[PDB]
Amino acid sequence: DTSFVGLTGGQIFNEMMSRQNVDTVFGYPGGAILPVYDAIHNSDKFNFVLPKHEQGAGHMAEGYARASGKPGVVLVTSGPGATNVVTPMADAFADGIPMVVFTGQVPTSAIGTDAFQEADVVGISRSCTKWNVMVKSVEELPLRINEAFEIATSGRPGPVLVDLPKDVTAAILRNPIPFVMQSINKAADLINLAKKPVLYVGAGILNHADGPRLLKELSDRAQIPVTTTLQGLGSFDQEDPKSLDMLGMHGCATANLAVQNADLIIAVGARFDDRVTGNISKFAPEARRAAAEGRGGIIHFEVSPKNINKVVQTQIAVEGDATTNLGKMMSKIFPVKERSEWFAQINKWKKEYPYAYMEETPGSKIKPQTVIKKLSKVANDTGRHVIVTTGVGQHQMWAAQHWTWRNPHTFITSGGLGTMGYGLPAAIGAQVAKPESLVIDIDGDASFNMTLTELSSAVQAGTPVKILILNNEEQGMVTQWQSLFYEHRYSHTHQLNPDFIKLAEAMGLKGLRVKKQEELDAKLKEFVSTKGPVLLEVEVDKKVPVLPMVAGGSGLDEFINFDPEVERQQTELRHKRTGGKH
Amino acid sequence: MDTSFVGLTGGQIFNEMMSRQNVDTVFGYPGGAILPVYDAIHNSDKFNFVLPKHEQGAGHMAEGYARASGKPGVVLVTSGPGATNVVTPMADAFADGIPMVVFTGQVPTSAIGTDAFQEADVVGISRSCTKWNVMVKSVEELPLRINEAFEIATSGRPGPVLVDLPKDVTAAILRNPIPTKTTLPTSRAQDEFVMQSINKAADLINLAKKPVLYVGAGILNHADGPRLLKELSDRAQIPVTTTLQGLGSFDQEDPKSLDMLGMHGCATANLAVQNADLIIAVGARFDDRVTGNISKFAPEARRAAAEGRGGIIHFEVSPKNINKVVQTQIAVEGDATTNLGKMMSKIFPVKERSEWFAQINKWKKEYPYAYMEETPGSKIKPQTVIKKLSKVANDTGRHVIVTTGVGQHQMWAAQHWTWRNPHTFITSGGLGTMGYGLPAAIGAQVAKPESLVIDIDGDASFNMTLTELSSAVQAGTPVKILILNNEEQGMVTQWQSLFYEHRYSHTHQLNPDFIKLAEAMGLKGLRVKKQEELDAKLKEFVSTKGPVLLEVEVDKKVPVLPMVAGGSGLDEFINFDPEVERQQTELRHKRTGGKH
């Protein structure tokens, strides 16, 4: 090819973005990356979103990718610019989010001299990228860009980093540049044999446009109840009777009980992380027993060999794209008419273990769980497409439990790394991906404080995001652990919040606040109906634990369920131990 | 052996080690993996705990605290995102040699390598930006690792170190005695070698005719640094120039002061360096923002060296920075201050240097820090604000500490402020981290409760970490935040104006209402736009008790000059010229379609 000859490395970058079908780029300029910013000045090949902090660009790109299905592209400078995107990269690495991060670097002749704004970005990002590299020459630039996008979007999607020395991007190109089938059958037999099967679905099913469809097909065909992980929410319609909801540490008791009593667990695009399995040795006993008798066990539809048999020994492993392999064994699955025995047990659990919690009473404070339920309906009553992002903590768990998920790619949350401050920037990026959607960020006060500077970025990008802050004036998830395992010793978990409404107004947004239950319903209406970016602060009760809960050495079936009397005794104890402070 | 810790948890042992290491302040943010340690320091009276809204804030606060106190900054954050959030501050401290010990919680040892919840390979991530790091494998070695961390961070060239703390290690109870040495916090040939290099250095200095002391941060790493630097300067009549990180080490009120050298340094300083026959480098690393085109650096010193009558003497503590950028004739290893003390008696007292000084005074009159001053109806000039604030702050009689963001405002603060006291300028130089200003100011205020702490910030820099505004309120640190608002990434637009034909690619951001932001955060907000209101607002600013933010609307697209860039030598600098600034303005309006 000789179409690039005569162009600078930066101009080649501009063209390559076009070839990769990039329509949006998130970044912050800086000295080392100036040659690239000059070549993309007023570019019409893609839109550009400017944050206030590189961490924002990073999280914005993640939200964008998770909502659009396309890799998020980041463009920052060297030194601090690159170190500032490490968290987003580690975050995208843990959740398998496709992201291509371009970092400006000092001239190749300055590298290794402790140069101005120089960092060993390739070394620093090594553990949090599927692959990274430093471009040495302009003739090598197109190849590295093409490899970066390919790697980031194949296998298990993930982040990649391309280091761009200033002299390389300023340089002008002169010279023209140049068994599974067996596993599928063995897996189908086991399924046809299962008496109490359960579908354990994860983020993997959402990595293919036809994932949700085939999942439903297999579920309806063989009548198999489906439970999903935090990252799997949205892949299955929770309206369907076969829905077990979310499993794990803070999952539905029914979901966890089903998994513990199942003779066959079909793992689809899930990695059995420690937030799901509970005590690994106590995980899926019935499945282990069934496997011992050659009448069940665990089937794993995983794309990455290294996640196979990593946490728990499986009986059958189907390597490759889950959606693809499911479509292949569909014809090898005997249609199941009914499962009265299995379904009877599950329905009994449902009625027995619902998402119970201390509901409001005359004069009491608004309850966080209630806000989620109400907001879920109101948002749905708009008919608009809905995408929800969140921060990290109790509010995140409650948003997961009390919202009714039915559409894929509508829940964007930080799971593996659990990065506080993810909500706002991720929502902004998601809004850019789906301009027509009603993007809502269900945030916590502590999380919000982390990246609240991006509020002005929302206004500058023209993203009418709705920011909901469940303010319990505490780092709730940590405080819950201190209450439960640390004799109510709240060590540095209560920060001083700024006036959120005045903050919103200062940032150029509309601010709303709710204190009384009598105003919640109306405020929620106005919130979702407001045109443009808006922030709604809802004062919710404090020291409210997320239940059920499976922690420590407890098995998924040994969960701590809600009990009104226990909460009351806990409140009295908390008061006595904190001197009536909490 | 030592059995005094038997029965204690790792967290409790940690708490105990802090007081043994003389730690009076800890900056941190709690999280799951680090809970055992947080439970152990709950209500501890061994030290004041400072809580930010973001771990990056904790890191920068710790740096500002260290730079102002001379003590290592201690950070305590959780695993995963908590640790990755402090990578910038560590890389920042690594670049500027700031002593800091970062403690990051970690998942249980049995969960490491399983892609556990909130797990990150922090020792791998931080290896290139710490002097040393380690992951404590058992509670038995916790005291050992803590002592090694503080020792390493505070010796040689100070820097950051990271200690990874697995949750099971900190929650574990020590059930085995441990070596007493691990719990408790020279060569005759080398000394004679150093003295020999000192005698060689003295000999070279005694024959110099046009000497120049090039002083950096190293001189401030010792309490007697400034004093000895002054004694040597007076004894041998040697003019003194400092790097950005050396500002405050030499009284700029002294006639022998040359001010700052480098890319944006005083022309006199740069000219003195280009014509000196001897350059006595004291605690400076010849970085690329100082030397200009290296092959054009100190030509007269290179010539004197070739003739065996001069060259470069380097007082450096780290072997890594000896003969790294330029060939030096005599390297004096070790603490600069200490070595200057040993060398003093070998220095011949000098009556005077008429010719040398006359030449320098000639350059001073010809090349002052000139710029376009205000005119009727024009916006306030950033340089003018600095000069006015400098005098208002100095006249208070209080001890003043200045922190900054990164950019033009940073350079103008360095040039136009009158530096006289050590450890009063706290700025990010090597890595140049925008957003450093506020958190660093809070940290410095904590270190020096009686000091008037001022953060001279840029609008873009301030936006990076403005969430720490509420932290200042919660911490009780009455920091004075000054925002020189030009509504642009000034330092970048300056480069775009000079080398990219005024093409401002994504360097203009939409700012929030700073005064309303300040008040929303819980502090007093002030704004000034008119020239005649500047004096009164600055007075109100520094006189306000409590944290306060003052936004000053300043002119836009104003370049920082002098400027040495590209392949230019320190003497081939661009100087301020009113006609040129006018022509540039005209060219800019046309090229940007009147937008800028």
Ligand SMILES: Cc1cc2nc3c(=O)[nH]c(=O)nc-3n(C[C@H](O)[C@H](O)[C@H](O)COP(=O)(O)OP(=O)(O)OC[C@H]3O[C@@H](n4cnc5c(N)ncnc54)[C@H](O)[C@@H]3O)c2cc1C
């Ligand atoms: C406060 C907090 C509480 C939490 N509580 C819970 C909880 O109670 N319950 C819970 O479920 N989670 C919880 N989590 C989230 C949790 O940490 C994990 O992030 C999440 O469970 C991982 O879900 P996943 O396995 O589905 O997705 P991932 O972690 O992304 O793993 C996906 C798996 O699918 C594979 N795969 C990917 N793409 C494909 C493809 N195309 N074809 C085939 N296979 C593919 C991957 O390589 C991998 O093995 C919590 C997190 C936080 C922050």
Ligand SMILES: Cc1cc2nc3c(=O)[nH]c(=O)nc-3n(C[C@H](O)[C@H](O)[C@H](O)COP(=O)(O)OP(=O)(O)OC[C@H]3O[C@@H](n4cnc5c(N)ncnc54)[C@H](O)[C@@H]3O)c2cc1C
């Ligand atoms: C926008 C921008 C513009 C800049 N412009 C300029 C400019 O024009 N001029 C300028 O000077 N800088 C400028 N800088 C800062 C610059 O990048 C360097 O950070 C600074 O010059 C380094 O100064 P230093 O060498 O004194 O300190 P350091 O970088 O900290 O280096 C100190 C040196 O002293 C040694 N040393 C340390 N302790 C001791 C001891 N006890 N005894 C003996 N030796 C010791 C070290 O190990 C090292 O080699 C700029 C930065 C930015 C962000």
Ligand SMILES: COC(=O)c1ccccc1S(=O)(=O)NC(=O)Nc1nc(C)nc(OC)n1
């Ligand atoms: C970023 O540094 C490098 O990449 C870098 C690092 C070491 C040597 C030379 C460079 S450079 O000569 O090619 N570019 C450069 O110096 N750029 C730059 N951009 C801005 C906007 N401000 C300032 O300096 C105040 N410098």
Ligand SMILES: COC(=O)c1ccccc1S(=O)(=O)NC(=O)Nc1nc(C)nc(OC)n1
């Ligand atoms: C941080 O993770 C680990 O260190 C971690 C990682 C993998 C396995 C086990 C742990 S743990 O069992 O020892 N602690 C733990 O899980 N803590 C914790 N703390 C809070 C405040 N919230 C939540 O979970 C929602 N978990």
Ligand SMILES: Cc1ncc(C)c(N)n1
């Ligand atoms: C943190 C940060 N982002 C961008 C630039 C240019 C800088 N100096 N620092």
Ligand SMILES: Cc1ncc(C)c(N)n1
């Ligand atoms: C960024 C960040 N800091 C602290 C905790 C606990 C978290 N989940 N994320």
Ligand SMILES: [K+]
């Ligand atoms: K639900």
Ligand SMILES: [K+]
């Ligand atoms: K000065």
Ligand SMILES: [Mg+2]
């Ligand atoms: Mg909260």
Ligand SMILES: [Mg+2]
């Ligand atoms: Mg500015």
